[PDB]
Amino acid sequence: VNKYTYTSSKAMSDISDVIGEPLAAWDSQVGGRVFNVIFDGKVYTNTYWVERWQVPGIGSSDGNPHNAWKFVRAATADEINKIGNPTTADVKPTENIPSPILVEDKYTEETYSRPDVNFKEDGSQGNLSYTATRVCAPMYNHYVGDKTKPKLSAYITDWCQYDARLDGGGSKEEERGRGFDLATLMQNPATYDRLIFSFLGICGDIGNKSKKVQEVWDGWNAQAPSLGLPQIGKGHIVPLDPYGDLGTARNVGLPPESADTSIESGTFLPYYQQNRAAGLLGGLRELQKKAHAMGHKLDLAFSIGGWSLSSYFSALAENPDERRVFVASVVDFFVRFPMFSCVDIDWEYPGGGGDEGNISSDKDGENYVLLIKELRSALDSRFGYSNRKEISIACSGVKAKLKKSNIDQLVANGLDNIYLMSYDFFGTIWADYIGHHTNLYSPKDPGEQELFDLSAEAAIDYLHNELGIPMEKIHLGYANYGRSAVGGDLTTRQYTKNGPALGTMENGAPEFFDIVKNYMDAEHSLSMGKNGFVLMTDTNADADFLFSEAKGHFISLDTPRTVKQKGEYAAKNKLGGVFSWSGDQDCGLLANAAREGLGYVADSNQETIDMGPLYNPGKEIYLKSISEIKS
Amino acid sequence: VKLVAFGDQTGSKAEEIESLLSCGENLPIVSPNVIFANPIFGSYFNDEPFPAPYHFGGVYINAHQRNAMTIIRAEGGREIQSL
């Protein structure tokens, strides 16, 4: 564990029981040692770790993100003379850089130079950047067992796969694509307690991508007779891309040895099992092996359904035997990959919502409850309790449709957990006004918090108070991308609708790591907006954001400080668990911060990098709620 | 400071001294049925073993002082704590 010591001295005659400490003016104090520093004639002790932006002045009953930098005013005028009393200051970014942050990408610079991309830091010449995640540094400190705290998890997806800039590319977005090697986390595993690969699917799905469903179903049905195995209809689960999942070596932390990447949908099927599993999924098993080599086993998991593949949920509803066949494919998968700690489902619309391809009725929620119970029953019927699995679903926070989800019966039918999507509340391309797409906290004037100012706490309170659900059964997290909006006016939250907005790959969805590259910095031991891009924070909702005047472009985003706020709240609650959506594109600083928010403690005096200076707030402002502005 | 040089001038076996130093596994013991006052013991920072040797068993061999001499890791062979 980390450890530090200090000492104090007095005359041989005098022995204070308290830690005596030299009286001095406040000036950029820091660390763990006692400080009684003086300012404005008052005398101030932060009875907690000290940070270079924290100020005792405000600190008299503030000065840390949680409580009073308490004080007395014992200092006399001649003390205020012998020490030149401070009365104001401002911490600056230092000149040196205490730690490297990242490394450039040749190909991303080439990308910016591309005559279509034309990317620039200001985005003037190019609204998108398609920056390679390879730019990133490892950025994970190390931490104690800390068994009591709620579990930590992260989501993971296929976009880890490819950036043909590694392959030259140069002409199309995927050639300028994104992806990373899990080797990153592997270097220092147990970074989380659980993981969730992105929602996969089943035969018969309806959305745009369904040609993939067709293809894989074809490969399956062709293989099945040759394997001497029964054919499958709709509702049977799909792996989406076994070639990615297994027919891989790059990005999957394992030597190209045995990487028969040639194998594919028409051929993978014998290999469709953990023992044989090459590539990504196999590597994951190996990751867990290293993890256990230490101990503290990860909850390896994934789920199915989700934003873009939920379409068949209604269709499968009220088709009980096909639902049976579906869960049969579920348990079959379990048999094929008993490695898994659990897997879950990603139904998203008991009442219709999201993409319209998700056809839906009212009864959907009821039928969904029913089938869910039936799933639980099947699950219990297969599993041995010594190895039992317990299931979760996300939730949308749609004040009403969440009710329509009938969580009560889900709980009564052994659905153990819920993960609240805590992000993208700001439907930036269509939303009426700019707002924080991920605000946990209620701003003032809740009079309009129905399609706006959607403090998740409201739903939280519904479940706890208005639904009695124990916090244990509910989980929350954060995501590693902000929103971006054109022409927004900070006074009105009015903004340029439809106008194209910043993203490396996804307009309107600025990508955290590249923001670290472009707009924000910390190299000088601080939270540091850079390149003329405004760092800013609102007192109304504890909101945190970024701006640029030349295009009136705004970004709403979580921050180290802000995820700190979140995790600290959740911890104070003692929620069921904590996680991060889209974990694929943070260096890990937000995870280290997440440990801090969980109160999860580091295990050594050494660091991968510091984190304290990342919690100074941005440009303070008060933003009126939508209701406040309209009123 | 070298254990063997010492023992040789001593004309006596090093183990005798090691036992003098109680440095073997024969660690001191104390009854459960007594609690010593001023118990600055057992803290996560009370790393010293208790009872201490400079507090029990051979105290006189030290100035009733924390830095009791003991075996220390070999360098040019096994070694004595300090002068």
Partner: peptide
């Protein structure tokens, strides 16, 4: 000279599984 080392001490023999995921090739 009869130069002598210490005991073939126990250290702590540890009951734990055997795999290169447990045993170590170092490489």
């Amino acid at each position: 000279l009869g130069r002598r080392p210490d005991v073939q001490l126990t250290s702590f023999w540890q009951p734990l599984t055997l795999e290169d995921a447990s045993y170590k090739t170092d490489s």
